[PDB]
Write a protein that binds this ligand. Structure first.
Ligand SMILES: [Zn+2]
Ligand SMILES: [Zn+2]
Ligand SMILES: [Zn+2]
Ligand SMILES: [Zn+2]
Length: 185
């Protein structure tokens, strides 16, 4: 239903006074890394239509951007009931994360983002200690796909990465369904 104002927001325009707190369950769902769709060339039409409206960019450099961009080996995230399970190699880790606010970011492009931060306070879980969802939303609302940044250093390091953003769409969707979305977008 996306409003028109929620849309200048997704594009990185918003007043820092409009961001609001979100909860872990904006991101409940079972979810699939779109990386394998990069790798089998399933996403090219996206990177195509994009070099078609960017004269600074060739199909080549765009693809290379999303390659470095989506690379993860967390194949699959499942989030539900306060817990986040990561699937890397026929083995999950999970942890009951705790909301720890949001950082507002301004990118080198003058453009802005909000990372909604969480942390694992479980001594006994083996999940990443620090996670940050960023999903182009600034206020409570169910995600449609998201970037998650994850690490065990601090929050600030993650805040520092602009290089990698493993990107997740819902498991329901077909490859055909995923690309469709990244165009109508
Ligand atoms: Zn501020
Ligand atoms: Zn698995
Ligand atoms: Zn993004
Ligand atoms: Zn989308």
């Amino acid at each position: 239903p996306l409003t028109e104002v929620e849309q200048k927001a997704a594009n990185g325009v918003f007043d820092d006074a409009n961001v609001q707190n979100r909860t872990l369950s904006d991101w409940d769902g079972v979810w699939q890394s779109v990386y394998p769709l990069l790798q089998s060339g399933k996403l090219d039409p996206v990177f195509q239509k994009k070099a078609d409206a960017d004269k600074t960019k060739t199909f080549a450099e765009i693809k290379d951007y999303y390659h470095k961009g989506y690379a993860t080996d967390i194949e699959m995230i499942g989030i539900e009931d306060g817990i986040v399970e990561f699937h890397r190699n026929n083995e999950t880790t999970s942890c009951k994360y705790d909301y720890d606010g949001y950082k507002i970011l301004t990118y080198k492009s003058g453009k802005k983002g909000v990372r909604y931060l969480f942390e694992c306070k479980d001594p006994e879980s083996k999940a990443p200690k620090y996670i940050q969802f960023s999903d182009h939303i600034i206020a409570p609302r169910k995600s449609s796909h998201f970037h998650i940044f994850m690490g065990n250093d601090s929050q600030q390091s993650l805040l520092n990465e602009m290089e990698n953003w493993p990107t997740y769409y819902p498991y329901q969707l077909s490859s055909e369904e995923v690309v469709e979305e990244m165009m109508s977008h």
